[PDB]
Design a protein around this ligand. Sequence first.
Ligand code: OZQ
Length: 359
Amino acid sequence: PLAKDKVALLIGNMNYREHPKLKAPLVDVYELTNLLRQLDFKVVSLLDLTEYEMRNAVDEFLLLLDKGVYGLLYYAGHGYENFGNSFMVPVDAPNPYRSENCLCVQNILKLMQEKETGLNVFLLDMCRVTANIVFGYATCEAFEIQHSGLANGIFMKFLKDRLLEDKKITVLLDEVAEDMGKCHLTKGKQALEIRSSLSEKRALTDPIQGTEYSAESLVRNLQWAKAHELPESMCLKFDCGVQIQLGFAAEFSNVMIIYTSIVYKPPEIIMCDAYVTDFPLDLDIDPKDANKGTPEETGSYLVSKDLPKHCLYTRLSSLQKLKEHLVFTVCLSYQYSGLEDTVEDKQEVNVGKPLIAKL
Ligand SMILES: CCc1cccc(CC)c1NS(=O)(=O)c1ccc(-c2cc(C(=O)O)co2)cc1C
């Protein structure tokens, strides 16, 4: 069995405006992204999407599902069930739940049934002609804290240990269901429901068609690369002599970490700090969560010890809301040894449209 292409969309909703916040989707989406990339999937990973953002991302993923393509859609977050229908709850959903503000799972499944995909795996990890659809519906908020301090969901804990196996995906999911049935938290409970219309031996490990005769995979690699460009590191020189470096890192397709570091501080300056401020209003960055001494303090625990020491960190987690160039100010507060007060100096910076903001 061959795949025309391998495309995946992973959505993790945590920071809910009107519902309890979740912790596991952060690590789960991150770890599943790296695992799927190892299996040659072009992965788009998105955190904290609103109703209109979720609908657009799912529609765009559905658009990639041409004949023979392998697709994987994973959603982790709040879910709701109402009279035979299940719904994915976006972060801007009002309380109480209502269908028009949520994404109907049955409507997605119905649109997936119309595709001629080689394999379509739709996995929900919710806090409650064949299309070859394999649907996994986990209803575990329960999670486990690792030796690292990161929260791993019950479904993903077992899934990550078996996802790289060269076995038929339905057989793989049935092993994960057995693992959860042995787990004390989910032992005698209906924690995972698998529905499958898979008539042939398809696996996530199946190779992609050769590029000599099938160039669809190359186009999608170019489009994935285009939507995943990080700004290059930049050095700003200030009038007092201080030089600041602005660094960039990616956590998810819509989550970027910005850090500032002091490259040079003249001897005359006793203490200086470079802060990033005045970001575009659509980004919704609360200044009390920016310019932290560690990446963890910003909510960034993946790509945390992989950033230089003695920097200030800022997490931009809503890049899908950016409709213009990312223009912000680098503020430098500095003190001379024998001076009365702190001196302020501001410099504007344009880093274009990073990651999915490019689209
Ligand atoms: C081929 C690479 C790929 C693999 C898997 C899945 C996709 C589509 C999701 C894509 N295409 S992409 O060009 O990288 C892409 C990435 C993100 C978004 C998006 C829209 C919103 C929003 O409207 O809020 C947020 O993100 C839209 C696209 C077209």
